[PDB]
Design an enzyme around this catalytic site. Structure first.
Site, PDB file in Angstrom:
ATOM      1  N   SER A 107     -49.761 158.658 -45.087  1.00 10.00           N
ATOM      2  CA  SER A 107     -50.686 158.367 -43.985  1.00 10.00           C
ATOM      3  C   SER A 107     -51.431 159.578 -43.448  1.00 10.00           C
ATOM      4  O   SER A 107     -52.329 159.396 -42.618  1.00 10.00           O
ATOM      5  CB  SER A 107     -49.990 157.615 -42.857  1.00 10.00           C
ATOM      6  OG  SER A 107     -49.672 156.303 -43.289  1.00 10.00           O
ATOM      7  N   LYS A 158     -55.110 159.247 -43.580  1.00  6.87           N
ATOM      8  CA  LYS A 158     -55.882 158.483 -42.595  1.00  6.87           C
ATOM      9  C   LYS A 158     -56.842 159.370 -41.818  1.00  6.87           C
ATOM     10  O   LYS A 158     -57.888 158.892 -41.352  1.00  6.87           O
ATOM     11  CB  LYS A 158     -54.938 157.695 -41.670  1.00  6.87           C
ATOM     12  CG  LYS A 158     -54.193 156.562 -42.402  1.00  6.87           C
ATOM     13  CD  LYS A 158     -53.081 155.942 -41.549  1.00  6.87           C
ATOM     14  CE  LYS A 158     -52.496 154.705 -42.246  1.00  6.87           C
ATOM     15  NZ  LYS A 158     -51.030 154.544 -42.013  1.00  6.87           N
ATOM     16  N   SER A 190     -50.799 154.556 -36.777  1.00  5.64           N
ATOM     17  CA  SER A 190     -50.570 154.591 -38.222  1.00  5.64           C
ATOM     18  C   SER A 190     -50.620 153.177 -38.818  1.00  5.64           C
ATOM     19  O   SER A 190     -49.893 152.838 -39.757  1.00  5.64           O
ATOM     20  CB  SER A 190     -49.290 155.359 -38.564  1.00  5.64           C
ATOM     21  OG  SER A 190     -49.391 155.966 -39.845  1.00  5.64           O
ATOM     22  N   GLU A 194     -53.884 150.858 -48.896  1.00  5.16           N
ATOM     23  CA  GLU A 194     -52.569 150.590 -48.346  1.00  5.16           C
ATOM     24  C   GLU A 194     -52.083 149.238 -48.856  1.00  5.16           C
ATOM     25  O   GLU A 194     -52.869 148.289 -48.919  1.00  5.16           O
ATOM     26  CB  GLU A 194     -52.643 150.520 -46.815  1.00  5.16           C
ATOM     27  CG  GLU A 194     -53.120 151.784 -46.143  1.00  5.16           C
ATOM     28  CD  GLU A 194     -52.118 152.921 -46.223  1.00  5.16           C
ATOM     29  OE1 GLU A 194     -52.446 154.034 -45.731  1.00  5.16           O
ATOM     30  OE2 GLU A 194     -51.007 152.710 -46.773  1.00  5.16           O
ATOM     31  N   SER A 238     -45.386 158.964 -44.223  1.00  7.36           N
ATOM     32  CA  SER A 238     -44.138 158.831 -44.975  1.00  7.36           C
ATOM     33  C   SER A 238     -44.300 157.793 -46.079  1.00  7.36           C
ATOM     34  O   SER A 238     -45.222 156.977 -46.073  1.00  7.36           O
ATOM     35  CB  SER A 238     -42.941 158.500 -44.065  1.00  7.36           C
ATOM     36  OG  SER A 238     -43.066 157.198 -43.521  1.00  7.36           O
TER      37      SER A 238
HETATM   38  O1  J1X Z   1     -43.312 151.515 -40.953  1.00  6.04           O
HETATM   39  C1  J1X Z   1     -43.020 152.517 -41.556  1.00  6.04           C
HETATM   40  N1  J1X Z   1     -42.694 152.548 -42.952  1.00  6.04           N
HETATM   41  C2  J1X Z   1     -42.733 151.326 -43.741  1.00  6.04           C
HETATM   42  C3  J1X Z   1     -43.525 150.225 -43.398  1.00  6.04           C
HETATM   43  C4  J1X Z   1     -43.509 149.092 -44.187  1.00  6.04           C
HETATM   44  C5  J1X Z   1     -42.719 149.057 -45.320  1.00  6.04           C
HETATM   45  C6  J1X Z   1     -41.942 150.162 -45.646  1.00  6.04           C
HETATM   46  C7  J1X Z   1     -41.069 150.148 -46.893  1.00  6.04           C
HETATM   47  N2  J1X Z   1     -41.432 149.627 -48.092  1.00  6.04           N
HETATM   48  N3  J1X Z   1     -40.400 149.822 -48.922  1.00  6.04           N
HETATM   49  N4  J1X Z   1     -39.433 150.445 -48.269  1.00  6.04           N
HETATM   50  N5  J1X Z   1     -39.812 150.671 -47.008  1.00  6.04           N
HETATM   51  C8  J1X Z   1     -41.941 151.292 -44.858  1.00  6.04           C
HETATM   52  C9  J1X Z   1     -42.942 153.830 -40.770  1.00  6.04           C
HETATM   53  C10 J1X Z   1     -41.985 154.806 -41.114  1.00  6.04           C
HETATM   54  C11 J1X Z   1     -41.961 155.977 -40.348  1.00  6.04           C
HETATM   55  N6  J1X Z   1     -40.982 157.002 -40.644  1.00  6.04           N
HETATM   56  C12 J1X Z   1     -39.737 156.705 -41.041  1.00  6.04           C
HETATM   57  C13 J1X Z   1     -39.097 157.939 -41.181  1.00  6.04           C
HETATM   58  C14 J1X Z   1     -40.071 158.935 -40.854  1.00  6.04           C
HETATM   59  N7  J1X Z   1     -41.184 158.295 -40.528  1.00  6.04           N
HETATM   60  C15 J1X Z   1     -42.834 156.172 -39.266  1.00  6.04           C
HETATM   61  C16 J1X Z   1     -43.781 155.179 -38.961  1.00  6.04           C
HETATM   62  C17 J1X Z   1     -44.759 155.369 -37.818  1.00  6.04           C
HETATM   63  F1  J1X Z   1     -45.065 156.691 -37.731  1.00  6.04           F
HETATM   64  F2  J1X Z   1     -45.872 154.648 -38.069  1.00  6.04           F
HETATM   65  F3  J1X Z   1     -44.221 154.930 -36.649  1.00  6.04           F
HETATM   66  C18 J1X Z   1     -43.836 153.995 -39.716  1.00  6.04           C
HETATM   67  O1  J1X Z   2     -46.611 151.853 -46.147  1.00  8.12           O
HETATM   68  C1  J1X Z   2     -45.594 152.486 -46.243  1.00  8.12           C
HETATM   69  N1  J1X Z   2     -45.094 153.339 -45.205  1.00  8.12           N
HETATM   70  C2  J1X Z   2     -45.798 153.515 -43.943  1.00  8.12           C
HETATM   71  C3  J1X Z   2     -46.559 152.499 -43.363  1.00  8.12           C
HETATM   72  C4  J1X Z   2     -47.215 152.745 -42.171  1.00  8.12           C
HETATM   73  C5  J1X Z   2     -47.076 153.981 -41.549  1.00  8.12           C
HETATM   74  C6  J1X Z   2     -46.303 154.971 -42.152  1.00  8.12           C
HETATM   75  C7  J1X Z   2     -46.129 156.321 -41.487  1.00  8.12           C
HETATM   76  N2  J1X Z   2     -47.012 156.897 -40.636  1.00  8.12           N
HETATM   77  N3  J1X Z   2     -46.458 158.059 -40.280  1.00  8.12           N
HETATM   78  N4  J1X Z   2     -45.297 158.220 -40.867  1.00  8.12           N
HETATM   79  N5  J1X Z   2     -45.065 157.145 -41.627  1.00  8.12           N
HETATM   80  C8  J1X Z   2     -45.645 154.737 -43.338  1.00  8.12           C
HETATM   81  C9  J1X Z   2     -44.744 152.418 -47.530  1.00  8.12           C
HETATM   82  C10 J1X Z   2     -43.434 152.971 -47.560  1.00  8.12           C
HETATM   83  C11 J1X Z   2     -42.708 152.880 -48.757  1.00  8.12           C
HETATM   84  N6  J1X Z   2     -41.354 153.428 -48.824  1.00  8.12           N
HETATM   85  C12 J1X Z   2     -40.495 153.215 -49.849  1.00  8.12           C
HETATM   86  C13 J1X Z   2     -39.328 153.919 -49.513  1.00  8.12           C
HETATM   87  C14 J1X Z   2     -39.582 154.534 -48.256  1.00  8.12           C
HETATM   88  N7  J1X Z   2     -40.824 154.195 -47.896  1.00  8.12           N
HETATM   89  C15 J1X Z   2     -43.272 152.286 -49.899  1.00  8.12           C
HETATM   90  C16 J1X Z   2     -44.577 151.751 -49.838  1.00  8.12           C
HETATM   91  C17 J1X Z   2     -45.211 151.119 -51.059  1.00  8.12           C
HETATM   92  F1  J1X Z   2     -44.210 150.601 -51.830  1.00  8.12           F
HETATM   93  F2  J1X Z   2     -46.075 150.139 -50.683  1.00  8.12           F
HETATM   94  F3  J1X Z   2     -45.880 152.108 -51.699  1.00  8.12           F
HETATM   95  C18 J1X Z   2     -45.325 151.833 -48.648  1.00  8.12           C
END
Ligand code: J1X
Ligand code: J1X
Length: 263
Positions: free
Chosen positions: A45, A48, A105, A141, A212
């Protein structure tokens, strides 16, 4: 040469088990401190920022662009839509989508920014136009976050992203009012208190964008206004060997703390 700061970052990296990338620009003297500064990392992200900035650049020749409505349909919702889900069957303006992408995000909002630019390559094209030859956005995304080791898609280097963030927020890649709007958005981020800013003195002011994804990838890019001195730009990227690894925002804080101690 390896500096004391670089040696400390290598020790932090070694204890963390992962791969850490750091780029600092100190805008007082333009000096740079880099650790794996020319290696590629998945942006997640943090990309973005480039998409929002590209729309800001478009708005320089269209006074009403940021008020332009974009329809949100249920089919547009992806995996993290804290703002866009409230507007399904309605609209959000490009300013609302930019603020949602940067400060919450929101992944659906990011997809609308990408679409306004004609697809991921439209984001890459804007990066080239502002002198960034390294950034590439290849996917939308949520798949741009797969973060597979060795995959070039959706990557940049710490050095390139620090230079770009400086030009966008402190330099003249954007018009004056657009640069100010980007700074305002970054300063109002909600997601960043455990990342770079957790490693800095509390008196400093930070605007940042986190990211992340897969492989425990944990990222933050920030513009920092210390008390009483010129701003800094800091990129901290971190990625791990196993697909299911846990996020490590504390490693980003630790990298920022080492950087701050070295100034
Ligand atoms: O929402 C998130 N991650 C997400 C969303 C949807 C699916 C998956 C997924 N897909 N497969 N496995 N997990 C993962 C996500 C994660 C983090 N964060 C976690 C540890 C450090 N930072 C922070 C934020 C935020 F900053 F926006 F608040 C959003
Ligand atoms: O979309 C995602 N994560 C997300 C979503 C929104 C905000 C943030 C964020 N913002 N700031 N910090 N985190 C992060 C996300 C995460 C994962 N995943 C797998 C293991 C851990 N994670 C996999 C995938 C994918 F399989 F589609 F590729 C997408």
């Amino acid at each position: 040469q390896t500096s004391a700061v670089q040696q400390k970052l290598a020790a932090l990296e070694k204890s963390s088990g992962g791969r850490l990338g750091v780029a600092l620009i100190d805008t007082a003297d333009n000096t740079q401190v880099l650790y794996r500064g020319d290696e590629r990392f998945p942006m997640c992200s943090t990309s973005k920022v480039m998409a929002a900035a590209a729309v800001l650049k478009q708005s320089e020749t269209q006074k009403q662009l940021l008020n332009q409505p974009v329809e949100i349909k249920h089919a547009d919702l992806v995996n993290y839509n804290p703002i866009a889900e409230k507007h399904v069957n309605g609209t959000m303006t490009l300013a609302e989508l930019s603020a949602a992408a940067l400060q919450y995000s929101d992944n659906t909002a990011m997809n609308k920014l990408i679409a306004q630019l004609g697809g991921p390559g439209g984001v890459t094209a804007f990066a080239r136009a502002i002198g960034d030859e390294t950034f590439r956005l290849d996917r939308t995304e949520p798949t741009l976050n797969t973060a597979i080791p060795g995959d070039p898609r959706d990557t940049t280097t710490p050095r390139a992203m620090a230079q770009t963030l400086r030009q966008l927020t402190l330099g003249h890649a954007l018009g004056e009012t657009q640069r100010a709007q980007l700074v305002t958005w970054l300063k109002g981020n909600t997601t960043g208190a455990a990342s770079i800013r957790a490693g800095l003195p509390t008196s400093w002011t930070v605007g940042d964008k986190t990211g992340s994804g897969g492989y425990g990838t944990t990222n933050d890019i920030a513009v920092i206004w210390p008390q009483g001195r010129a701003p800094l730009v800091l990129v901290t990227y971190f990625t791990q060997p196993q697909q299911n690894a846990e996020s490590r925002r504390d490693v980003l804080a630790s990298a920022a703390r080492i950087i701050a101690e070295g100034l």
